[PDB]
Design a protein around this ligand. Structure first.
Ligand SMILES: O=C(NCCc1cc(C(=O)NO)no1)c1ccc(Cl)c(Cl)c1
Ligand SMILES: [K+]
Ligand SMILES: [K+]
Ligand SMILES: [Zn+2]
Length: 354
């Protein structure tokens, strides 16, 4: 009955040398860690060390060319870092970026190992840069390697290829990279909730819509819950978990749950524009703890209001440690529309939705 925590200040070294106020700040992770100390959560956790992912581990999801190219950035002069970053959608690179991406992934492997060997029951990983936009063959959206996707493949590599892994992506953005990596896989159920706005919200692709249900043997194993029509908050998130995430997850019966835990749907976030509260994130975490015999690993993705992400992620760790969930309207019409669209898309695959 132990919660793991991984945090390494070396992941602060990745930085934007042209714009020191870019929202994906080094301080995101140090602020979250500090808040865990302030609330006396850090001393209640088992500290798991960070390590570098190996290149062979990265090749679980990424092409050798992609790994090679990111690695080459370690000794580039500024002009070349600029040029390379600009080849992608929404990336900045420094000489430390590759190492930090390796540390984020390796931290999460050590956390998954700790859970699967029974050293801890659940864990939290305070890591940057984020992962979920990274594709097999490209970086995207502040992400270099797909930490969460790699962690699912790493878990399978130390257990069995068919280990059932649920990935719940509650970052306000679609994890396009995670959906693509697993699109034909029935061993990894990907469930994302995300602002969509009919394709106006980053990453601006209809890949994020509710009708993308998976392909081939993976059909039914990709669940997109897209929001349209502006701000959403605790009522909408709780309803999506009630009607969709939790019935489907129970039917899938995962053996490990990974949370792509961006905190950019939080109240106060300048990019997300949503209103999920710290108490809301606590309730979503407490629900997920009912799956997989409690085997849950929470992985930081996005989230840009330093106070919001620090309070929100700390509340999640408090839930993982077994604290009682804190005390928490009708849904926006368009949220009802979204949920019902997903129910219709997935009722052919999941009896629980019928
Ligand atoms: O590039 C930007 N936005 C698009 C890329 C992106 C990815 C994420 C994210 O949180 N993904 O889950 N979030 O954004 C960007 C950069 C600077 C500023 Cl100030 C803003 Cl508002 C956006
Ligand atoms: K998401
Ligand atoms: K899948
Ligand atoms: Zn995000």
């Amino acid at each position: 009955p132990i919660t793991g925590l991984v945090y390494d200040q070396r992941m602060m070294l990745h930085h934007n040398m042209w714009d020191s106020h870019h929202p994906e700040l080094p301080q995101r992770i140090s602020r979250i860690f500090s808040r865990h100390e302030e609330l006396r959560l850090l001393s209640r956790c088992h500290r798991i060390p960070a390590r570098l992912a190996t290149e062979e581990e990265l090749a679980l999801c990424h092409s050798s060319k992609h790994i090679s190219i990111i690695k080459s950035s370690e000794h580039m002069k500024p002009r070349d870092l600029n040029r390379l970053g600009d080849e992608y959608n929404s990336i900045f690179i420094s000489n430390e970026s590759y190492t930090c991406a390796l540390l984020a992934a390796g931290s999460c492997f050590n956390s998954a190992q700790a859970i699967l060997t029974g050293q801890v029951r659940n864990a939290v990983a305070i890591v940057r840069p984020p992962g979920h936009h990274a594709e097999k063959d490209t970086a995207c959206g502040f992400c270099f390697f797909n930490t969460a996707a790699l962690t699912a493949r790493y878990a399978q590599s130390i257990t069995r290829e068919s280990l059932r892994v649920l990935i719940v992506d509650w970052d306000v953005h679609h994890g396009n990279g995670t959906q693509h990596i697993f699109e034909e896989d029935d061993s990894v159920l990907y469930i994302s909730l995300h602002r969509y706005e009919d394709g106006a919200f980053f990453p601006n692709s209809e890949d994020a819509n509710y009708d993308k249900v998976g392909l081939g043997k993976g059909r039914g194993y990709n669940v997109n819950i897209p929001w349209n029509g502006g701000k959403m908050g605790d009522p909408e998130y709780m309803a999506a978990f009630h009607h969709l995430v939790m019935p489907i997850a129970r039917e899938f019966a995962p053996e490990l749950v990974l949370v792509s835990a961006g905190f950019d749907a939080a109240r106060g976030d300048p990019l997300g524009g949503f209103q999920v509260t710290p108490e809301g994130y606590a309730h979503l975490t407490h629900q997920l703890m009912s799956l997989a015999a409690g085997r849950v690993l929470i992985i930081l993705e996005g989230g840009y209001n330093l106070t919001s992400i620090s309070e929100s992620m700390s509340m999640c760790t408090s839930m993982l440690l077994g604290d009682s969930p804190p005390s928490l309207t009708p849904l926006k019409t368009s949220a009802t529309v979204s949920i019902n669209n997903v129910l219709r898309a997935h009722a052919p695959f999941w009896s629980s939705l019928r």
